[PDB]
Design a protein around this nucleic acid. Structure first.
Ligand code: ZN
Lengths: 149, 147, 79, 330, 924
RNA sequence: GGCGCGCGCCAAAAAUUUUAAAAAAAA
RNA sequence: GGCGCGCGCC
C-alpha cells in the first residue's frame, strides 16, 4: 500500500518539476474576471523568427490591449476541454474562471498544430467571436450519406 | 466485437459538444464512407439543419472519390458530421478564398507536404484527455477495448 | 577645427601653401594652410585653410570666390 | 489527481515522428495559449494572422535581400524542452528534434505587467550583442556605484571595413610657431608673389578689393581689435572697447585710393567707394654619544662648491632706484 | 610612557600661551627680561610677538604657530640677534633651497655675519648664523662634525613641512640626534595639534617647551565663488568671518541649472579684476601647462607703462648678463621677455632657475601684476598680492587626484593681503559641475589639518646607526613622534573599554539561556538566507532574468531603497553593474556629482531616478515585469513608472512573488538543496521552540542584539589596546637587518663590515644597489660618459609616456643594472618584506640616459633640450642631483681603497658641469 | 529658312588628410 | 547645354 503512494507521489513531483511553466503565482487579488485577468501566454520557442521579433510581439500585445480599451465604449463559455492553470500553494470566486485556458496552438511554418480548439455560441459559428469562415462556392449541395439539402 | 467497440468510441467522439469545437476552417479530418475513402479533407464550415449537423469538407472528387490516375477536382462536399473516420489535429493556414482553382490546388499541395512531414500516420485526437470526455461509459468502453 | 576650416579647389599646380595663405590672410586671420600631399608626395587638387575666428569662413567665401588666380577661378566650400 | 495533472501536462506534448532538417526554421514557433478574457477571445484571428505575417515578413527581408542570419543564441539555463508522447523510437533525428524544441522564454501578459520567467537567452552576456533586448533611454547621472563608489577604416576608426565604404562617422610658452610654420605676412598690403600669381600687376588695382568694398570691412580683423567689456557683477547680499590703432589699411576701400590707378568699378561688377565705407566715417563711429663618537670610521664632512657673493643682486638692487612700491612707500 | 604636563598661562586675547614641561618639575612664571633688547623694531609689536620674544629671552624652547601673513620671522630675528650678542653660534634650518637662498640674502643684509651651507654652495663656512637645509644638518650630525659643538640655538622654519611623507623624516632624525643643551625655535603654519608637538619636545629633551597660538591676520579677507557657467561673483564668506549660506546656495543652483543642459573663462575674471582695480593678483593653477595656457591667452591686455617697460628690460638684461651667448639666445629665455614687458609672468617648476628668480624679483618690486604660478610660489618670502584666484580645485598629490585640503586652501589664501597698502584682500574660487555643496562647504568652512609624523625606516639610517656605538636603531624607533603620537592615544581606548564594559554589564534580559539560543538560531537562519541570496547572484543564473522592465528589490547594508525597475545592465573589469530605477531624495540628488545614491525618506516625497548598482546588492529578483516607456528622460515618465509599481504592489496584498532559486532559475547543484534543507530544519526548530511561539518577544530580541553589538565593540577595543602597547615597526626593522646581513653588509652580531661602511656615505641615490654594483666591478668597465649616463638612472623620478631608443653604448650596462636590481629585489622579498619586484625595478627610469650622454660630451643645451619632451627645469634638476650624487660616489670609491673609479667619477663631474644648468643663483 | 554629324572651350562634377594626465622636492 | 569652328541633309 505505502509503496503505491510512494510511487504516486514520486511521479507527481517528477511531473510537476516541469509543470512550473503552467503555474500562476497565488495571492493575486483580481476581481471582475471578465476584464481583469491574463490575456496570453506566449511560450517563445527556439526559432530565430521569435528570437528576433520578441519585441514586436510584445508591442503587438500592448497594441491589442490599447485598441480594446479605446474602443470598449465606442458569451463564450469554455468548451468542455478547457483546463485551468495550476496555482502553486503559498475565496476562489473570480479566481476560478479567470485562469481558464481555451485553446493551445503550436505554430509551425505552414500548419498550426492545434489542440483544445476554441469555443462557440450554442453551436453557431456564424455568430461566434473567433471563427474566420472561408469563401467557397458550394457547387455540390448533396449530403454524402443522407438526402441532399 | 472490437469493431463494435470502435463504433462506440467514435460515437462518443462524434457527439456534438465533444467534436464541434474542434471543427475549424483548417481542421484536417479524414472522411470515409463504407468501402470508399476520399483521403484527407480540410473542414471549411459546419452548420445545423432543422436536429442534424453537416460539415463542409474540401475533398478530392472524380461526389465519389477521385481515381488514382486522374487528379481530384478538389471541391467542397457537405458530409454528415458522423461520417468522419478520424479528426486529426493539424489545423492548416487557409487562404479564405477557395473559389479559384489555384487556391484549392495549393491546399492539396499543402496537405501533401504535411503528409510527407509525418512518415508514420498523422497525430489524432484522444477522446479521453484532448476532448475532456468525463463519461464513465467511455472509460468502460476503453477498458473493453484494452481487453 | 570643423567650422573654422575652408576647402579650396580649382588651383594651378604651382600653387603652394604660401600663396594661398597670403591670399586668404586678407579676409581673416589664417593659422595654417596645407596643400594636401599625395601618396607620392606631390600636391593635390585642393587645399585647406584654417581661420582663427568662426565668423571668417562665410566672409572669405563671400569675398574670395571666383577670384582669378593664375588666370584660373577657385571654387571654395564650407565643411 | 494524476489524470488531470497529465491533462494539463499534455499541453506541452509534441507528437513524435516529425522529421526535421533545417532546425533553425523547420521547427515550431511561439505557442500562444489563449485564455478566458475578452481581449483575447475577440482578437483570435488577429493574432493568428499576426504570426503568419511575422513569418511572411521574415521571408520578405531575410530570405530575399539581406540573406544574413547566423545567430548563436544558445538557450539560457532556465530553458525547458517540451515533453513528447512516445510513439516512435529515439534516434539522432529525434535528438535533433529535442534540440529544435526548446522553450527559451515564457510570459503571461496581464493588462499592465507580465509575469515573465525563464528570462531571455544571452549572447556573451551583453544586451548590445543580443537579439530581442531593447534598452530604454535614461540619464546616467550618478556615475557612482552604490556598492563601491570608488571604481581598418579611418572614417570612424573601425577595424571592420574601409573608410571609403563606411557610412558611419596645450602649447609651451616659448613655442609661437602657430603663425610661423612657413612664413609671416601682413593684411592690407599685397606681396610681390601674390601680385604675380594673381595675374594683376602694380598698374592694376587688386581685384578682390572690388567685392570687398561691395561687402564691407572684414570682421575677421575687427575682432582682434575687440577688448570686450566683460560684464560680471559681484552679487552681494555692453560698452565694448575698440582699439582704433590696429585697424587695417585698405587703399581703394576706406583710405584714399592710390593715385594713378584707374577706378575700375564698372569692370568685374562693383560700386564706387561710399562715405560709410570711408575710414573716417566708420572708424570714428566706433645617551647620545658625543660628536667625537659619531665621526669615527666614516669620511669627515667636507665643504665643496666654495663660492663668494657674485654681487649681481647688489647691481640689480642699485638699478631699481625707483619702482611702484619704492615710490609709494617713501 | 610620556611623562609631561601642560599648563596654560594667562594672556591677552588672541594668543593662547601654554607650557608643556616634565611632571616632576614645577611651573614658575618666566622672569621678565633684564637689560637691553637684542634688537629693536620700528613698528609696534603684537601681543603674540611680544610673548614669543619674552620666551626667547629666558632660554626656553618655543614653538610659534601663526599665519604666514602675521610676521613670525620677527621672533627668529630676535633669537638670532640674542645668540650673536653672546658670541653663540646659531643655525637656521629651512626646507627648500630657494627659500634658503632668499633667507640668506635677507639675513646677510640684516647682520652681515651670515653664511650658507646648502648642497650646491658653501658661502662663508666659518660664520655664526649659518643657514642650511635640514638634510645637510642631518649629514653633519651623522658624520659627527664639530661645527655643531658651540650651537646655542636651532631655528626650524615651517615644521609643518614634517608630514611631507617622503622627506618629512629628516626633521625627526635631526631633532632626536641633537644634544639636550641646544634650544629650539620652531615656526609653523597654523595647526590644531600644537600641544602634542610641544609635549613631544618636552618629553624627548626633558626641557620645558612653550606654545603660542594665534588665529589673527592683519588684513581681513572676503571670499568669492565663480560658478562655471554663470556670469557674476557671489560673496560667500564676508570679511566679518561669518558664512553666508544663501549666496552659496544661489551659486550652486546656478551651477546646477547651467550643467543640467571674453573668449575664455579666467580671461573674463582677469579683465574684471583689471577694470575693477584689484590689479596685483596671483592665479593658482595646479598644472605645469594650465598656467602657460592661461598666460598665453592674455595677449590682449597691458598693465604696465613705458617707464615700467624700460625698468623691466633693464632688470632682465642685467639678470641674463651672467649666461653665455648661445645660452642667452635660447628660445625659452627670449620668448618670455614680451610677457614680462606688458606685466604677465609664469612661475612653475618647469622653468629655468634663472627665469624663476628673475620673475620673483620683478614681482617683489611690483613690475609684474598677474603671476600664473602653481603652489610652489605660495611659500616665497614676503611676496603677497591683493587677490588670489583658484582656477581649479583638484590637485594630484603623490598618490592620486583629490580635492585640495582645507589646509592648502588656507595657506594659499594667506597670500592675499599686504599690510597697509590695501586694506582688504579678495580671494576668488572658481567651481565646476563636479564640485558639490558637500565639498565647497567643507573647503570654505574647514580648518588646517593636524600634523602627523611620516616616520619610516631606510637603509641609510640603519647603516649609519649601526656604524656608531652607544646607540641602536631601536633608539630612533622609540623616540620618533610616531611612537609618541601612538602612546598618546591609550587613555582614549582605556576609557572606551571601561564605558563599553559598564554598558555591557548594565542591560540584562529577563531570560538569558533560552533567549540567547533563540537569537543564535535566528541569526544562523539569516546567515543561511544570505548564503542563498549569494547563490542566486551568479553570472549565468541572474543575467537572463534582468530585463528592462524587471522588478527587483535593492538594499545595501543597513539601508534599503526598495523596489526598483531594472533599466539596463552591463559588464566591466569581472564585475557587472545593473542600472536600476530607484527613489532618491533631493538632498542626495543635489550632491550627485561626487556622491553615491542614498534612499529617500518615505515620510517625504522623493524623486524616481536612475542609480547604478552591483549584483551583490540585489535582494530579490521578483518574477513580475513592467512595461517600460522606453523614454525615461522626462520626470513624468518616471512618475508614471512609480504609479505602475504602486498599482502592481497593491495587486499583491500579501507580497510580490519572488523567483524560486531551485526551479525558476534552473540551478541543479547539491549546495542549494542542502542549504534549503538546513533552512527548513532551522525554521521548524524555531517554530517548535517554546520561546518562539510566545508572542510579544521582539523587545528581548532588540536587547539581545544590542548586547551582541556591545560585545563586538568590547572585543574590538580589547584587541586595539593589546596591539597598541608595542613598537609599531620592529618587524620592519628586523626585516631590514636580515636583508642587510644576508647581502653581506652587516655581520652575525650586527657589526658593520667594509661594505656597510662604504654604503653609509651614498645618501641621495639608492645605497644597497649602488654599493653592490660598485663592489662587483660593474663600473670598472664603463667609461666616464657612460658611467655618468648610467648613474642618471637612479635620480629621475618623473612620470613620462615617452620611451628611450638606447644605442649599443648606453643600453648594454642598463641590462646589467636591471639584473642586479632583480637580485636585490628577490633577496629582499624572500626575507618576508613587502616588496614588489616589478614596481621596484620600474622606478629606475632610463629615459634620460641618451640626453645626459649627449650633454656630457660637448653639446649645447638647446640641442639636448630638443632630444626629449620633459621641461627644461626637470633636466636641470636631474643634472644637479646627478652632480651631487657623483660627488658622493667619488668619495665612496675613495673610501673603498680603489683610485681608478675615483678618476672615472672625477672625469664625469668635470664633463657634466659647464653651462646654464649650473648657473650660480643671482640671489647670492 | 529648318535639320543632322567631327570637335577645342568654359558650363558645370564629385572631392571634404581618425584615433591619457599629474604638483613638489634633497643629503 | 551653348561660344560655336567645320562638314553634311531637308
Ligand atoms: Zn568605419
Amino acid at each position: 500500500c505505502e509503496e503505491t503512494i510512494e510511487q504516486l507521489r514520486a511521479e507527481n513531483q517528477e511531473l510537476k518539476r516541469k509543470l512550473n511553466i503552467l503555474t500562476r503565482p497565488s495571492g493575486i487579488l483580481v476581481n471582475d474576471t471578465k476584464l481583469d485577468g491574463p490575456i496570453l501566454q506566449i511560450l517563445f520557442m527556439n526559432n530565430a523568427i521569435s528570437k528576433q521579433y520578441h519585441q514586436e510581439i510584445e508591442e503587438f500585445v500592448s497594441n491589442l490591449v490599447k485598441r480594446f480599451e479605446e474602443q470598449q465604449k465606442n458569451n463564450l463559455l469554455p468548451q468542455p476541454s478547457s483546463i485551468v492553470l495550476e496555482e502553486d500553494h503559498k475565496a476562489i470566486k473570480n479566481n476560478k474562471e479567470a485562469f481558464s485556458v481555451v485553446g493551445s496552438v503550436l505554430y509551425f511554418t505552414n500548419f498550426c498544430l492545434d489542440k483544445l480548439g476554441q469555443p462557440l455560441l450554442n453551436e453557431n459559428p456564424q455568430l461566434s467571436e473567433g471563427w474566420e469562415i472561408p469563401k467557397y462556392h458550394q457547387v455540390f449541395s448533396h449530403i454524402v450519406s443522407l438526402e441532399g439539402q | 466485437q472490437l469493431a463494435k467497440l470502435g463504433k462506440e468510441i467514435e460515437e462518443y467522439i462524434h457527439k456534438p459538444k465533444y467534436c464541434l469545437p474542434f471543427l475549424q476552417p483548417g481542421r484536417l479530418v479524414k472522411v470515409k464512407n463504407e468501402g470508399d475513402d476520399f483521403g484527407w479533407g480540410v473542414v471549411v464550415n459546419f452548420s445545423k439543419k432543422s436536429p442534424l449537423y453537416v460539415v463542409e469538407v474540401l475533398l478530392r472528387c472524380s461526389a465519389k472519390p477521385a481515381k488514382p490516375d486522374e487528379k481530384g477536382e478538389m471541391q467542397v462536399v457537405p458530409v454528415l458530421v458522423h461520417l468522419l473516420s478520424a479528426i486529426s489535429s493539424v489545423r492548416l493556414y487557409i487562404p479564405k478564398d477557395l473559389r479559384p482553382v489555384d487556391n484549392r490546388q495549393s491546399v492539396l499541395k499543402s496537405i501533401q507536404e504535411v503528409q510527407k512531414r509525418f512518415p508514420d500516420g498523422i497525430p489524432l485526437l484522444d477522446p479521453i484527455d484532448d476532448m475532456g470526455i468525463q463519461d464513465q461509459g467511455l472509460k468502460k468502453v476503453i477498458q473493453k477495448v484494452e481487453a | 577645427e570643423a567650422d573654422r576650416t575652408l576647402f579650396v579647389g580649382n588651383l594651378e599646380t604651382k600653387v603652394t601653401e604660401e600663396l594661398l595663405f597670403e591670399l586668404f590672410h586678407q579676409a581673416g586671420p589664417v593659422i595654417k594652410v596645407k596643400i594636401p600631399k599625395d601618396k607620392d608626395g606631390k600636391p593635390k587638387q585642393f587645399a585647406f585653410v584654417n581661420f582663427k575666428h568662426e565668423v571668417s569662413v562665410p566672409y572669405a567665401m563671400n569675398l574670395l570666390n571666383g577670384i582669378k588666380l593664375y588666370g584660373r577661378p577657385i571654387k571654395i566650400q564650407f565643411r | 489527481e494524476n489524470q488531470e495533472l497529465k491533462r494539463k501536462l499534455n499541453i506541452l506534448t509534441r507528437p513524435s515522428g516529425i522529421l526535421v532538417n533545417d532546425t533553425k526554421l523547420d521547427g515550431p514557433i511561439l505557442q500562444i495559449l489563449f485564455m478566458n478574457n475578452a481581449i483575447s477571445k475577440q482578437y483570435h484571428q488577429e493574432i493568428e494572422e499576426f504570426v503568419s505575417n511575422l513569418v511572411k515578413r521574415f521571408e520578405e527581408q531575410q530570405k530575399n535581400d539581406v540573406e544574413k542570419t547566423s545567430f548563436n543564441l544558445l538557450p539560457q539555463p532556465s530553458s525547458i524542452v517540451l515533453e513528447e508522447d512516445h510513439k516512435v523510437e529515439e534516434s539522432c533525428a529525434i535528438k535533433n528534434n529535442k534540440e529544435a524544441f526548446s522553450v527559451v522564454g515564457s510570459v503571461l501578459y496581464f493588462t499592465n505587467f507580465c509575469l515573465d520567467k525563464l528570462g531571455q537567452p544571452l549572447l556573451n552576456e551583453n544586451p548590445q550583442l543580443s537579439e530581442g533586448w531593447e534598452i530604454p533611454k535614461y540619464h546616467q547621472v550618478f556615475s557612482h556605484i552604490v556598492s563601491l563608489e570608488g571604481q581598418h577604416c579611418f572614417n570612424c576608426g573601425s577595424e571592420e571595413h574601409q573608410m571609403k565604404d563606411c557610412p558611419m562617422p596645450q602649447q609651451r610658452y616659448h613655442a609661437e610657431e602657430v603663425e610661423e610654420r612657413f612664413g609671416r605676412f601682413k593684411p592690407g598690403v599685397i606681396s610681390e608673389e601674390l601680385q604675380d600669381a594673381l595675374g594683376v600687376t602694380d598698374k592694376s588695382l587688386p581685384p578682390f578689393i572690388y567685392r570687398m568694398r561691395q561687402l564691407g570691412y572684414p570682421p575677421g580683423w575687427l575682432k582682434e581689435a575687440e577688448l570686450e567689456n566683460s560684464g560680471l557683477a559681484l552679487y552681494d547680499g555692453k560698452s565694448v572697447t575698440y582699439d582704433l590703432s590696429k585697424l587695417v589699411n585698405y587703399p581703394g576701400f576706406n583710405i584714399s585710393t592710390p593715385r594713378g590707378i584707374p577706378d575700375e568699378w564698372r569692370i568685374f561688377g562693383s560700386i564706387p567707394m561710399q562715405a560709410c565705407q570711408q575710414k573716417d566715417v566708420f572708424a570714428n563711429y566706433l645617551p647620545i654619544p658625543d660628536m667625537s663618537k659619531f665621526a669615527t670610521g666614516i669620511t669627515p664632512f667636507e665643504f665643496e662648491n666654495m663660492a663668494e657673493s657674485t654681487g649681481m643682486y647688489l647691481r640689480i638692487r642699485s638699478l631699481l632706484k625707483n619702482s611702484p612700491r619704492n615710490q609709494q612707500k617713501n | 610612557m610620556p611623562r609631561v604636563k601642560v599648563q596654560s598661562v594667562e594672556t591677552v586675547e588672541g594668543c593662547t600661551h601654554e607650557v608643556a614641561l616634565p611632571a616632576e618639575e614645577d611651573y614658575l612664571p618666566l622672569k621678565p627680561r633684564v637689560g637691553k633688547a637684542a634688537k629693536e623694531y620700528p613698528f609696534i609689536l603684537d601681543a603674540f610677538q611680544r610673548e614669543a620674544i619674552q620666551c626667547v629671552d629666558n632660554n626656553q624652547s618655543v614653538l610659534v604657530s601663526a599665519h604666514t601673513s602675521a610676521g613670525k620671522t620677527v621672533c627668529a630675528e630676535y633669537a638670532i640677534a640674542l645668540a650673536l650678542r653672546e658670541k653663540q653660534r646659531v643655525i637656521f634650518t629651512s626646507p627648500i633651497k630657494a627659500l634658503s637662498n632668499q633667507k640668506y640674502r635677507e639675513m646677510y643684509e640684516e647682520f652681515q655675519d651670515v653664511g650658507l651651507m646648502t648642497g650646491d654652495v658653501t658661502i662663508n663656512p666659518t660664520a655664526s648664523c649659518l643657514v642650511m637645509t635640514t638634510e645637510i644638518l642631518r649629514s653633519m650630525l651623522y658624520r659627527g662634525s664639530e661645527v655643531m659643538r658651540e650651537v646655542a640655538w636651532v631655528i626650524f622654519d615651517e615644521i609643518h613641512y614634517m608630514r611631507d611623507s617622503e622627506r618629512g623624516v629628516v626633521w625627526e632624525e635631526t631633532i632626536i640626534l641633537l644634544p639636550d643643551n641646544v634650544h629650539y625655535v620652531f615656526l609653523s603654519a597654523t595647526i590644531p595639534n600644537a600641544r602634542q608637538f610641544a609635549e613631544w619636545i618636552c618629553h624627548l629633551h626633558k626641557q620645558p617647551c612653550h606654545v603660542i597660538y594665534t588665529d589673527y591676520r592683519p588684513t581681513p579677507l572676503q571670499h568669492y565663488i565663480f560658478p562655471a557657467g554663470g556670469d557674476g561673483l557671489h560673496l560667500v564668506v564676508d570679511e566679518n568671518g561669518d558664512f553666508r549660506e544663501d549666496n552659496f546656495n544661489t551659486a550652486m543652483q546656478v551651477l546646477r541649472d547651467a550643467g543640467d543642459l571674453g573668449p575664455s573663462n579666467v580671461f573674463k575674471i582677469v579683465k574684471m579684476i583689471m577694470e575693477r582695480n584689484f590689479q596685483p593678483v596671483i592665479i593658482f593653477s595646479f598644472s605645469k601647462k594650465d598656467c602657460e595656457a592661461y598666460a598665453l591667452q592674455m595677449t590682449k591686455l597691458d598693465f604696465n607703462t613705458d617707464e615700467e617697460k624700460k625698468m623691466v628690460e633693464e632688470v632682465f638684461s642685467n639678470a641674463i648678463d651672467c649666461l653665455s651667448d648661445e645660452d642667452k639666445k635660447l628660445p625659452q629665455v627670449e620668448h618670455v621677455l614680451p610677457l614680462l614687458k606688458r606685466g604677465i609672468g609664469i612661475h612653475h617648476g618647469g622653468l629655468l632657475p634663472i627665469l624663476k628668480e628673475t620673475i620673483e624679483i620683478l614681482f617683489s618690486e611690483g613690475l609684474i601684476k598677474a603671476l600664473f604660478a602653481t603652489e610652489t610660489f605660495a611659500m616665497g618670502i614676503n611676496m603677497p598680492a591683493r587677490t588670489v584666484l583658484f582656477t581649479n580645485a583638484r590637485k594630484f598629490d603623490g598618490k592620486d587626484f583629490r580635492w585640495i585640503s582645507s589646509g592648502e586652501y588656507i595657506q594659499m589664501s594667506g597670500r592675499a593681503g599686504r599690510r597697509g597698502m590695501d586694506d582688504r584682500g579678495i580671494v576668488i574660487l572658481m567651481v565646476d559641475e563636479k564640485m558639490s555643496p558637500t565639498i565647497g562647504k567643507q573647503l570654505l568652512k574647514g580648518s588646517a589639518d593636524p600634523l602627523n609624523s611620516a616616520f619610516h625606516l631606510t637603509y641609510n639610517m640603519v647603516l649609519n646607526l649601526l656604524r656608531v656605538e652607544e646607540i641602536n636603531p631601536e633608539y630612533m624607533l622609540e623616540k620618533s613622534f610616531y611612537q609618541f603620537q601612538h602612546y598618546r592615544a591609550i587613555p582614549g581606548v582605556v576609557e572606551k573599554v571601561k564605558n563599553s564594559e559598564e554598558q555591557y554589564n548594565k542591560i540584562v534580559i529577563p531570560n538569558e539561556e533560552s533567549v540567547v539560543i533563540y537569537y543564535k538560531i535566528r541569526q544562523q537562519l539569516a546567515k543561511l538566507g544570505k548564503e542563498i541570496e549569494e547563490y542566486i547572484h551568479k553570472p549565468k543564473y541572474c543575467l537572463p532574468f534582468l530585463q528592462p522592465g524587471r522588478l527587483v528589490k535593492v538594499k545595501n547594508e543597513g539601508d534599503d531603497f526598495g523596489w526598483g525597475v531594472v533599466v539596463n545592465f552591463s559588464k566591466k573589469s569581472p564585475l557587472y553593474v545593473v542600472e536600476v530605477l530607484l527613489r532618491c531624495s533631493k538632498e542626495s540628488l543635489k550632491n550627485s556629482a561626487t556622491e553615491a545614491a542614498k534612499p529617500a525618506k518615505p515620510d517625504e516625497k522623493g524623486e524616481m531616478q536612475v542609480v547604478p548598482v552591483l549584483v551583490h546588492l540585489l535582494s530579490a529578483i521578483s518574477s513580475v515585469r513592467l512595461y517600460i516607456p522606453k523614454d525615461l528622460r522626462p520626470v513624468d515618465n518616471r512618475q508614471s513608472v512609480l504609479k505602475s509599481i504602486q498599482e502592481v504592489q497593491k495587486r499583491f496584498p500579501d507580497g510580490i512573488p519572488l523567483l524560486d532559486p531551485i526551479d525558476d532559475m534552473g540551478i541543479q547543484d547539491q549546495g542549494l538543496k542542502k542549504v534549503i534543507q538546513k533552512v527548513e530544519a532551522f525554521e521548524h526548530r524555531m517554530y517548535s521552540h517554546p520561546l518562539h511561539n510566545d508572542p510579544n518577544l521582539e523587545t528581548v530580541y532588540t536587547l539581545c542584539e544590542k548586547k551582541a553589538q556591545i560585545a563586538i565593540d568590547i572585543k574590538s577595543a580589547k584587541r586595539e589596546l593589546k596591539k597598541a602597547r608595542t613598537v609599531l615597526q620592529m618587524d620592519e626593522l628586523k626585516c631590514r637587518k636580515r636583508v642587510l646581513r644576508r647581502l653581506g653588509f652587516a655581520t652575525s652580531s650586527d657589526v658593520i663590515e667594509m661594505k656597510g661602511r662604504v654604503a653609509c656615505e651614498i645618501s641621495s641615490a639608492d645605497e644597497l644597489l649602488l654599493t653592490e654594483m660598485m663592489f662587483n666591478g660593474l663600473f670598472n668597465d664603463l667609461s666616464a660618459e657612460q658611467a655618468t649616463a648610467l648613474l642618471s638612472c637612479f635620480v629621475f623620478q618623473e612620470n613620462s609616456s615617452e620611451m628611450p631608443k638606447l644605442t649599443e653604448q648606453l643600453a648594454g650596462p642598463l641590462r646589467q643594472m636591471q639584473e642586479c636590481a632583480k637580485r636585490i629585489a628577490k633577496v629582499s622579498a624572500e626575507a618576508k618584506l613587502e616588496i614588489d619586484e616589478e614596481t621596484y625595478l620600474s622606478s629606475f627610469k632610463p629615459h634620460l640616459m641618451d640626453v645626459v650622454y649627449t650633454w656630457a660630451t660637448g653639446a649645447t643645451f638647446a640641442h639636448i633640450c630638443k632630444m626629449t619632451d620633459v621641461f627644461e627645469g626637470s633636466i636641470i634638476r636631474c643634472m644637479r642631483r646627478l652632480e651631487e650624487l657623483l660627488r658622493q660616489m667619488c668619495q665612496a670609491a675613495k673610501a673603498i681603497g680603489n683610485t681608478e673609479l675615483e678618476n672615472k667619477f672625477a672625469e664625469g663631474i668635470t664633463k657634466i658641469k659647464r653651462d646654464i644648468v649650473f648657473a650660480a643663483s643671482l640671489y647670492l
